[PDB]
Amino acid sequence: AYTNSFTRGVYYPDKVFRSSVLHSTQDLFLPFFSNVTWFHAIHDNPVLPFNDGVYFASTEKSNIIRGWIFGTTLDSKTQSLLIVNNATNVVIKVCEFQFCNDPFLGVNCTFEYVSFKNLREFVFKNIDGYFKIYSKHTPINLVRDLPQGFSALEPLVDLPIGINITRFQTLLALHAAYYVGYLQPRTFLLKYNENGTITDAVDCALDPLSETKCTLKSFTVE
Amino acid sequence: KGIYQTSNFRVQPTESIVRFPNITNLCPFGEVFNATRFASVYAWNRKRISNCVADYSVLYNSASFSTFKCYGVCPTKLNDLCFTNVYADSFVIRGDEVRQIAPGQTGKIADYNYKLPDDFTGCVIAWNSNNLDSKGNYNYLYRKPFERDIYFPLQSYGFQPTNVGYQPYRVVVLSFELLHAPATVCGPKKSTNLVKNKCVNFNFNGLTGTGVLTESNKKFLPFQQFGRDIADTTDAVRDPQTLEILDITPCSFGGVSVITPGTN
Amino acid sequence: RQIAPGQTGKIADYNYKLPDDFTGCVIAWNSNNLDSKGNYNYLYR
Amino acid sequence: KLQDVVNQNAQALNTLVKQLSSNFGAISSVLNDILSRLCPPEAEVQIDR
């Protein structure tokens, strides 16, 4: 069950402000118009590979999706991230939890941190042990698909966990679809505005129009 | 006779505006270098050091260290230069195997259980442990960069006080993170007052330079630290004590041309 | 080992500093047969 | 023919300015970041690149 991935997967690749510049970068991004996988929370959380970073989205109305479980074996044999958001605090643990066969929520620890209408676009990846959460919330009015448009993604939390991850799983609040992109080494050309916000990006391997936009370092190709 | 271009006018900087985050906590190097039992090389510890003040001069002046090898920092300037995260890698190995711990070396300590990146930024700090770790001490065993590897490939040492090249050496490898970020670990250098609209010699968090710090309307995002130019020089910084945004215009300069008639 | 153009240390920085553009030879050998005693006459700053 | 004279010189200056952001083999394109992070025996190798 797939859908379209129109313009999503565009994050701020670094913590450096730049304004009114067409800066090129080479990092792990979501390719434009690729296949993001449509899932269920109706009337569904299998074990998804990670290979080179993982995009996430969640069309939400009542905060059903509330947790993440990462790792490789996920049965208290290796370290496992468990980002828990019970509506008031962000609890982030890397303990070896004795998970269930179907872990959910009912309506050797080395780190711990404690802090449809909504689309909670999340990005998760590892860079040499530095686990980086990139995220963005936005008000949408669409129940079926990713809303066509554009909005950039900022970081929230770096994590120096050093965890080998090849597989993962999310969590639900059982008494809301969610997407799995995959990040790839795609060179972009980011358009920072006057306020330093990405208004446009061009994937430098999408179609041969787009390589012309990357070679010229411009978006209006004459 | 004619106009001749000779020199360059440059306004000299008045004073030096040194600026650092006003944290006073001392970094726990004593829990690292003077810990009781170090872990082995196949399970080396990775202690995060953050949000403190790191006096590296204490670690540089003590004579209790065999070799003090810094590959990218040249440790005299560790007091001024200041980082985001400092990672201490504590493990005990055989005496001759410290030479394999370098960016660029290959070997059965380099390839198998503890690999350094070839672009490494930090210091390799090694000394002996003949007075404490030598016994037949058998607890120390051996088997990508920074990969903790948790017929057998598991081979154990034997440490005795009768054993130079086989004496157990305590080596701690400090790894430095120079990512342009909100910095946390910064050395003991006092911050001064900030003076705007004057050609000063600033130093924000380890970024040296000369410019005229003015006020800006460049609304940074609350994770953003530096604003850059086209030519990679820093155009705007965020003051790490009072979180406001400051432009960096370089001081007033221009060519000097000397209009003269002939000396005839 | 600290006696080299380019090395830093408490023999290099404190009491005997070499220029980094040094022209000459560093000639070292041991004195275990004569200078070893508790020989305390040798001090450093 | 006249807009091209303006374009080919704003192109060749904005290529010259973007050369300052290249490493050329050195560890960092910022010259004030080599001087604040390296010792003068080693820094003169990086600055000569």
Side-chain angles (χ1 to χ4, degrees), chain C residues 26-40:
Chain C
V26 169
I27 303 168
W29 66 97
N30 54 359
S31 64
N32 199 6
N33 54 359
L34 196 148
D35 291 333
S36 297
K37 291 181 181 179
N39 195 1
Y40 292 159

Side-chain angles (χ1 to χ4, degrees), chain D residues 26-45:
Chain D
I27 64 168
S28 178
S29 65
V30 176
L31 189 66
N32 289 316
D33 285 331
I34 295 172
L35 292 175
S36 67
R37 294 190 290 110
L38 283 175
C39 55
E42 180 63 30
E44 291 177 354
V45 180

Side-chain angles (χ1 to χ4, degrees), chain B residues 71-74 77 80-81 83 121 178 180 206-210 228 230-233, chain D residues 14 17-18 20-22 27-30 32-40 42-43:
Chain B
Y71 292 97
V73 190
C74 290
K77 296 182 177 68
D80 179 75
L81 173 63
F83 301 100
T121 298
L178 282 167
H180 294 88
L207 180 65
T208 60
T210 300
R228 288 185 187 274
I230 310 299
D232 199 73
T233 61
Chain D
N14 289 320
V17 173
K18 289 180 181 179
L20 295 177
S21 68
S22 293
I27 64 168
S28 178
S29 65
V30 176
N32 289 316
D33 285 331
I34 295 172
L35 292 175
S36 67
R37 294 190 290 110
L38 283 175
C39 55
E42 180 63 30

